[PDB]
Design a protein around this ligand. Sequence first.
Ligand code: ADP
Ligand code: MG
Lengths: 139, 370, 395, 50, 7
Amino acid sequence: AGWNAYIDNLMADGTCQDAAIVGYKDSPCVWAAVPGKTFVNITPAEVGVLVGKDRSSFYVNGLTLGGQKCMVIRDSLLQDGEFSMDLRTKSTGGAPTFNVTVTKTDKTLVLLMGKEGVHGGLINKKCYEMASHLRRSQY
Amino acid sequence: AALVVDNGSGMCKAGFAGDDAPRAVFPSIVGRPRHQGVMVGMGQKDSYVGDEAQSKRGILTLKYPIEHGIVTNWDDMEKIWHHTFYNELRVAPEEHPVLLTEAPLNPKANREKMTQIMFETFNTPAMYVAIQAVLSLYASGRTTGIVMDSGDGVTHTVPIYEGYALPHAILRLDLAGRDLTDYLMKILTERGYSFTTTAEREIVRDIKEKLCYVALDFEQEMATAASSSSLEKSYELPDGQVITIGNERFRCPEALFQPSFLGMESAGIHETTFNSIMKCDVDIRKDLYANTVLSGGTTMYPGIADRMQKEITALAPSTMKIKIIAPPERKYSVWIGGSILASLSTFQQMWISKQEYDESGPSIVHRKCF
Amino acid sequence: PPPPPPLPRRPTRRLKQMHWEKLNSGLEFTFWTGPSDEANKILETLHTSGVLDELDESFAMKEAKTLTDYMSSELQKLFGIHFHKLSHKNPNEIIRMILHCDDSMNECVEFLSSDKVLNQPKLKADLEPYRIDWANGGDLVNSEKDASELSRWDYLYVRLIVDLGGYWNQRMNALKVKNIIETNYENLVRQTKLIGRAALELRDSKVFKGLLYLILYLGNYMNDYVRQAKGFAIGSLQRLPLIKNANNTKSLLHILDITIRKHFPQFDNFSPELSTVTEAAKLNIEAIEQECSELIRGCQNLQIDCDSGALSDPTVFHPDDKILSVILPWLMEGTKKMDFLKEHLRTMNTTLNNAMRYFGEQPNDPNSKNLFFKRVDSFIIDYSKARSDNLKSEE
Amino acid sequence: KGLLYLILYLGNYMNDYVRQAKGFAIGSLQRLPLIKNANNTKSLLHILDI
Amino acid sequence: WXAXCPA
Ligand SMILES: Nc1ncnc2c1ncn2[C@@H]1O[C@H](COP(=O)(O)OP(=O)(O)O)[C@@H](O)[C@H]1O
Ligand SMILES: [Mg+2]
């Protein structure tokens, strides 16, 4: 209930500054996201890249997620057991960079990017947990 | 005090967090006598490891428990660790967390296997496992770069970035020190010296460490070596025999740059360094070139740094600058970086506890310490 | 969006836990489903056999033995990495040696020079009440704000970054420029001398002039009457390997090697005569010129800083801060270094330029200014391979 | 099958109540040698033979 | 041999 309430659950600990849920089936669209932030502006084309059959093209120059440039760390979305993705934002002029994680469920994609100085493992473990719960709910 | 133990194909390193040098540095070998014992009452041991095995290596059949990175014998691997704690370090593991290292692109099979033998046989209170390549540049004082990791078993090229490994960009090359030592003996027989057994395999290992060096120009040096006897050097065998090598000083190390000398289709580390950095992103590629680092005992050859700098410069575009970082302490860089990592105050966060392992089981390591 | 789901006999003592992988999915088809009486007699047998009792005694676990920091979690990792050599020393000891600008931490000062440590707005607000107004009065801004409560690295950051931030960036600039100059002036003079010598040698070489005249005279022979030019650029020398004879066995430059050897013994081998050109082709002129020009900009920027900048004011300086006492002795000598390098920089530019018009090309084209010795070196190796192939085939 | 049933009952008594499963994969046999007693002299398999 | 065996 209340797709936005998950975002509140995502922001309970304050270790992240952006969080979103998007349904990647049929026409991609955001179901709940932090207003005014990065994750609210996800385009279907970016979703198609994330779930596309090509798992090597995003290694040449990274990819964009909501228009913000980010680099690929490890890709395990299509592999059973984790269904998780790791990204790090790409910045210019020594601007702060942040770790980005994406977990793939049956119907949804869960996206978390943490605040400054936050280790990716903390961001990954949370997104895996709620993704694990959400798949147990047949979504 | 947290133990930092560095298992390696050739050498095993152990010490304490915050120390500037490993406390115990002994060979990673296991020995079993091939002859029956006739002198009774001595209490001669069944298996011999480390320096003591090296001391009496003549009457022992030395075996490397780890070959090509993969551990081929899990029963011997604990014994050298058992000797590591109680004998070399003389410390009880029951009250100290211990640090071990893992290899790039390691199969998932091993990673709980070390986990399931430490929390049970030695019941260490806490544990953490990281890449030896990641710890290499940590000792160098940088967090982003590419490491020219070469050792006794395997070689890996890891373009690290904020201390997070890139699995797709990891390139594995099978040109290690053991290969060169095996290549040194097959070319040393040209001078009438025949070393075949495993005990004398250490002898040639000693010879190349002292006499072999990297030549800047191969074609120029063979011509000079044939013309003059200046490059020839004399080495002393433990039996008192005197040997002399004329051109093998620069020929054996050259195979690291010309693998076709060994017959391997994969080319040298100079292109493999260039090959790996081609896989990374273009924008980050600027940083990786200028913070290249060398690591491992294989990279100890004199004149190796300028030779690789010259070759990759031709491979690299003329616009780019190449800065080969070769700290003289890079022999123990992997060990020192671990001691640095263990000493961190924030390092207590990603500990794996004995209690938490019990409910989580062996599988916790893949997600806790990754 | 669709509706969302809800939000998220026994032993007397704890013994060793033996974990397992469980059954794949469920025991839908496994023999575990079958409740055979063969398994039933096992359960009663173990309850009677003296096995479980021994299990309690032998396999009991060895218990567990388990055992206000505003600073960001990531940053504590970085500080311990670089200042590892000083772990045994208190914050009061390490705060003192750093101000001495000693040789032992010429490397650690670069780490605190990074943008990561400086660009931390949130900590600067947090440690601001703990700052001491050293600019005037030298007293704590707030009332008590004890510094012992702060952790080991927290004491250092506030006393070094927040406290001295007024001249911190200025002081690091005086020290960052200190390290770069101390090691590059020796090599930079070597690089500019080689380029100037190489340009003069090429301009003052009759052998290089003679071969060009021979090529021009031969070239005009096969060319048409309407294209009988009396000169050509250096970059036109690459057309010789691109011309082949009827059977493609011998190229135009290959005739030149045997023509020179048979009739022109003076032009037989010019590569040993002119060697500095080849080494000069391995250096970038614009990159070297920019690198040296960076030194003067830093030097003149330093003069206005020590004399009239933040470094000029000594009131904000701590008494145990010899940064003023170390830069000033080098200030006179450093001015000498920039004057000599400026003279060498002008020497290379004019020495390259007079030899630059001498062969018809201009520096206005940036590629021509850079790729000047490369084209000459490209012909040197091209002539070398042509001679080597000619000698090997005939012999 | 009798061997498999025997070790499973030993493990169920051996483990916690929250993890008292009634089955395991064949690949689960590998942890018998790596579990030792107090003095590391004998393992679960060593005492199993007796 | 010289260094090794008898040959
Ligand atoms: N001075 C030297 N010259 C040449 N080779 C050396 C020198 N010192 C050590 N080595 C080689 O380095 C190897 C040590 O490998 P090591 O780095 O310990 O492997 P690992 O990284 O797996 O621990 C030895 O086998 C030895 O042959
Ligand atoms: Mg190694």
